[PDB]
Design an enzyme around this catalytic site. Structure first.
Site, PDB file in Angstrom:
ATOM      1  N   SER A   1      -8.128  -9.183  -8.525  1.00 18.75           N
ATOM      2  CA  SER A   1      -9.132  -8.625  -9.200  1.00 18.75           C
ATOM      3  C   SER A   1      -9.445  -7.777 -10.357  1.00 18.75           C
ATOM      4  O   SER A   1     -10.138  -7.912 -11.833  1.00 18.75           O
ATOM      5  CB  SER A   1     -11.039  -8.671  -8.041  1.00 18.75           C
ATOM      6  N   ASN A   2      -9.377  -6.599 -10.190  1.00 23.93           N
ATOM      7  CA  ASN A   2      -8.968  -5.765 -10.963  1.00 23.93           C
ATOM      8  C   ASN A   2      -7.763  -6.033 -12.143  1.00 23.93           C
ATOM      9  O   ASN A   2      -8.288  -6.072 -13.177  1.00 23.93           O
ATOM     10  CB  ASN A   2      -8.413  -4.118 -10.237  1.00 23.93           C
TER      11      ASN A   2
ATOM     12  N   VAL B   1       0.302  11.838  -3.206  1.00 18.15           N
ATOM     13  CA  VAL B   1      -0.806  10.807  -3.887  1.00 18.15           C
ATOM     14  C   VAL B   1      -2.232  11.665  -4.161  1.00 18.15           C
ATOM     15  O   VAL B   1      -3.358  12.183  -3.052  1.00 18.15           O
ATOM     16  CB  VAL B   1      -0.104   9.876  -2.372  1.00 18.15           C
TER      17      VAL B   1
ATOM     18  N   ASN C   1      -3.896   5.051 -11.427  1.00 16.43           N
ATOM     19  CA  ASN C   1      -4.377   4.258 -10.689  1.00 16.43           C
ATOM     20  C   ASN C   1      -5.450   4.089 -10.129  1.00 16.43           C
ATOM     21  O   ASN C   1      -5.966   4.742 -10.435  1.00 16.43           O
ATOM     22  CB  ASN C   1      -3.439   4.756  -9.404  1.00 16.43           C
TER      23      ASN C   1
ATOM     24  N   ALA D   1       0.163  11.243 -10.230  1.00 17.36           N
ATOM     25  CA  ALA D   1       0.677  12.501  -9.764  1.00 17.36           C
ATOM     26  C   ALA D   1       1.837  12.390  -8.523  1.00 17.36           C
ATOM     27  O   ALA D   1       1.827  10.994  -7.747  1.00 17.36           O
ATOM     28  CB  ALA D   1       0.280  13.478  -9.640  1.00 17.36           C
ATOM     29  N   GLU D   2       2.685  13.112  -7.824  1.00 20.20           N
ATOM     30  CA  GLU D   2       3.688  12.969  -7.331  1.00 20.20           C
ATOM     31  C   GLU D   2       2.753  13.020  -6.201  1.00 20.20           C
ATOM     32  O   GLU D   2       2.811  12.113  -4.871  1.00 20.20           O
ATOM     33  CB  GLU D   2       4.719  13.799  -7.173  1.00 20.20           C
TER      34      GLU D   2
ATOM     35  N   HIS E   1      -8.686   3.920  -7.313  1.00 15.04           N
ATOM     36  CA  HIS E   1      -8.854   4.004  -5.848  1.00 15.04           C
ATOM     37  C   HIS E   1     -10.235   3.932  -5.240  1.00 15.04           C
ATOM     38  O   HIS E   1     -10.563   4.718  -6.421  1.00 15.04           O
ATOM     39  CB  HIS E   1      -8.119   5.367  -5.650  1.00 15.04           C
TER      40      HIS E   1
ATOM     41  N   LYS F   1     -15.963  -2.445  -5.518  1.00 15.33           N
ATOM     42  CA  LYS F   1     -14.898  -3.387  -7.046  1.00 15.33           C
ATOM     43  C   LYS F   1     -15.811  -3.965  -8.324  1.00 15.33           C
ATOM     44  O   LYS F   1     -15.375  -3.988  -8.892  1.00 15.33           O
ATOM     45  CB  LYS F   1     -14.869  -4.564  -6.144  1.00 15.33           C
TER      46      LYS F   1
HETATM   47  N1  LIG Z   1       3.399   8.915  -5.478  1.00 20.91           N
HETATM   48  C1  LIG Z   1       2.304   8.715  -5.392  1.00 20.91           C
HETATM   49  N2  LIG Z   1       2.261   7.042  -5.412  1.00 20.91           N
HETATM   50  C2  LIG Z   1       1.285   5.921  -5.514  1.00 20.91           C
HETATM   51  S1  LIG Z   1       1.211   4.931  -5.033  1.00 20.91           S
HETATM   52  C3  LIG Z   1      -0.966   4.682  -5.988  1.00 20.91           C
HETATM   53  C4  LIG Z   1      -1.331   3.589  -5.227  1.00 20.91           C
HETATM   54  C5  LIG Z   1      -2.317   3.912  -4.043  1.00 20.91           C
HETATM   55  C6  LIG Z   1      -2.040   3.064  -3.557  1.00 20.91           C
HETATM   56  C7  LIG Z   1      -1.416   3.741  -1.619  1.00 20.91           C
HETATM   57  C8  LIG Z   1      -2.352   4.721  -1.187  1.00 20.91           C
HETATM   58  C9  LIG Z   1      -1.815   5.133  -0.159  1.00 20.91           C
HETATM   59  C10 LIG Z   1      -1.318   4.430   0.227  1.00 20.91           C
HETATM   60  C11 LIG Z   1      -0.173   4.280   1.605  1.00 20.91           C
HETATM   61  O1  LIG Z   1      -0.304   5.592   2.119  1.00 20.91           O
HETATM   62  N3  LIG Z   1       0.606   3.913   2.113  1.00 20.91           N
HETATM   63  C12 LIG Z   1       1.497   3.186   2.760  1.00 20.91           C
HETATM   64  C13 LIG Z   1       1.637   1.643   3.615  1.00 20.91           C
HETATM   65  C14 LIG Z   1       2.483   0.477   2.611  1.00 20.91           C
HETATM   66  C15 LIG Z   1       1.746  -0.739   2.508  1.00 20.91           C
HETATM   67  O2  LIG Z   1       1.987  -2.259   2.897  1.00 20.91           O
HETATM   68  O3  LIG Z   1       0.427  -0.768   2.534  1.00 20.91           O
HETATM   69  C16 LIG Z   1       3.057   3.580   2.189  1.00 20.91           C
HETATM   70  O4  LIG Z   1       3.381   2.968   1.044  1.00 20.91           O
HETATM   71  O5  LIG Z   1       4.095   3.769   2.954  1.00 20.91           O
HETATM   72  S2  LIG Z   1      -0.510   3.382  -0.335  1.00 20.91           S
HETATM   73  C17 LIG Z   1      -1.288   6.156  -5.628  1.00 20.91           C
HETATM   74  C18 LIG Z   1      -0.083   7.131  -6.075  1.00 20.91           C
HETATM   75  C19 LIG Z   1      -0.002   8.205  -5.784  1.00 20.91           C
HETATM   76  O6  LIG Z   1      -1.082   8.521  -6.675  1.00 20.91           O
HETATM   77  N4  LIG Z   1       1.302   9.130  -6.207  1.00 20.91           N
HETATM   78  N1  LIG Z   2      -5.068   3.194  -2.615  1.00 23.51           N
HETATM   79  C1  LIG Z   2      -5.328   2.103  -3.659  1.00 23.51           C
HETATM   80  C2  LIG Z   2      -5.925   1.334  -3.064  1.00 23.51           C
HETATM   81  O1  LIG Z   2      -6.823   1.217  -1.685  1.00 23.51           O
HETATM   82  N2  LIG Z   2      -6.902   0.056  -3.422  1.00 23.51           N
HETATM   83  C3  LIG Z   2      -7.388  -1.093  -3.692  1.00 23.51           C
HETATM   84  O2  LIG Z   2      -6.584  -1.961  -3.159  1.00 23.51           O
HETATM   85  C4  LIG Z   2      -8.214  -2.645  -3.351  1.00 23.51           C
HETATM   86  C5  LIG Z   2      -7.363  -4.729  -4.476  1.00 23.51           C
HETATM   87  O3  LIG Z   2      -8.697  -5.498  -4.616  1.00 23.51           O
HETATM   88  P1  LIG Z   2      -8.101  -6.484  -6.435  1.00 23.51           P
HETATM   89  O4  LIG Z   2      -6.549  -7.256  -6.152  1.00 23.51           O
HETATM   90  O5  LIG Z   2      -8.789  -7.462  -5.890  1.00 23.51           O
HETATM   91  O6  LIG Z   2      -7.638  -5.312  -7.157  1.00 23.51           O
HETATM   92  C6  LIG Z   2      -9.483  -2.325  -5.179  1.00 23.51           C
HETATM   93  O7  LIG Z   2     -10.571  -2.201  -4.607  1.00 23.51           O
HETATM   94  C7  LIG Z   2      -8.378  -0.863  -4.774  1.00 23.51           C
HETATM   95  O8  LIG Z   2      -9.172  -0.086  -5.306  1.00 23.51           O
HETATM   96 NA    NA Z   3      -5.126   4.932  -3.965  1.00 19.57          NA
END
Ligand SMILES: Nc1nc2sc(CCCc3ccc(C(=O)N[C@@H](CCC(=O)O)C(=O)O)s3)cc2c(=O)[nH]1
Ligand SMILES: NCC(=O)N[C@@H]1O[C@H](COP(=O)([O-])[O-])[C@@H](O)[C@H]1O
Ligand code: NA
Length: 200
Positions: free
Chosen positions: A12-13, A143, A106, A140-141, A108, A170
């Site tokens: 949806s995003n 999360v 990203n 950034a590095e 969130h 959303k």
């Molecule tokens: N360096 C870096 N990589 C980034 S990626 C995303 C997108 C934000 C999404 C997520 C947030 C937390 C998650 C997590 O704890 N994920 C697990 C679960 C795996 C699965 O399959 O659900 C994993 O991947 O090990 S994922 C943002 C960021 C960021 O700010 N910085």
């Molecule tokens: N940590 C990242 C995270 O929680 N992402 C979340 O996944 C959904 C994806 O919806 P979509 O696939 O319909 O766009 C969104 O609500 C977004 O904030």
């Molecule tokens: Na996130």
């Protein structure tokens, strides 16, 4: 700016970003959609849009960097400028994030720095806030701690669940994510040399 959108689910995003980049004044064009999961509905939203799709399954890859390296390769192939993480649920490796520093957004579903991680809504409900929201930030590095570009507040209503809170959030996501992309694609916003966010 040439833009790639990475997804893991419904899209949806992605769909909100597609809608906005088709606007005449859009400074962004979406040239490739990448999903780490097959048969997810974002892939169809993108196919219906006429946007190329690629699936990179993080399972065929021994380590993360070999997996990201796979993605990078596609980004290069499509001469991408900006990467949009739209429901992409993989954590990106350090060199990948460093390479795309200042070029990767990203979305969130909290008001960062509150409720980092993958279950922001559960955290917000468990904690009892009456206001939550969503955040578009530079990746950034560490999360969900890159530089923040836009945020919108969303009320938490009595009796909310993940289903109803996330539905309401959303609607904010679909506003500030297209706006954030447009800010970054137009050069109006960038990561400054000082690492904080630069307006122009
Ligand atoms: N360096 C870096 N990589 C980034 S990626 C995303 C997108 C934000 C999404 C997520 C947030 C937390 C998650 C997590 O704890 N994920 C697990 C679960 C795996 C699965 O399959 O659900 C994993 O991947 O090990 S994922 C943002 C960021 C960021 O700010 N910085
Ligand atoms: N940590 C990242 C995270 O929680 N992402 C979340 O996944 C959904 C994806 O919806 P979509 O696939 O319909 O766009 C969104 O609500 C977004 O904030
Ligand atoms: Na996130």
């Amino acid at each position: 700016a040439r833009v790639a959108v990475l997804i893991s689910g419904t899209g949806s995003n992605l769909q909100a970003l597609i809608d906005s980049t088709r606007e005449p004044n859009s400074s962004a064009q979406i040239d490739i959609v990448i999903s780490n999961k097959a048969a997810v509905a974002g892939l169809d939203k993108a196919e219906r849009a006429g946007i190329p799709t690629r699936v990179i399954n993080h399972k065929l890859y021994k380590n993360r960097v070999e997996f990201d390296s796979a993605i990078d390769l596609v980004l290069e192939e499509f001469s991408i400028d900006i990467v949009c993480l739209a429901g992409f649920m993989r954590i990106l490796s350090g060199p990948f994030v460093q390479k795309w520093n200042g070029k990767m957004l990203n979305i969130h579903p909290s008001l960062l720095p509150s409720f980092k991680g993958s279950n922001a809504h559960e955290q917000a409900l468990e904690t009892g806030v009456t206001v939550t929201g969503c955040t578009v930030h530079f990746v950034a590095e560490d999360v969900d701690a890159g530089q923040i570009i836009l945020q919108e507040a969303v009320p938490v209503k009595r009796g909310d669940t993940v289903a109803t809170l996330s539905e309401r959030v959303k609607l904010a996501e679909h506003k500030i994510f297209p706006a954030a992309l447009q800010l970054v694609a137009s050069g109006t916003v960038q990561l400054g040399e000082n690492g904080k966010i630069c307006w122009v």
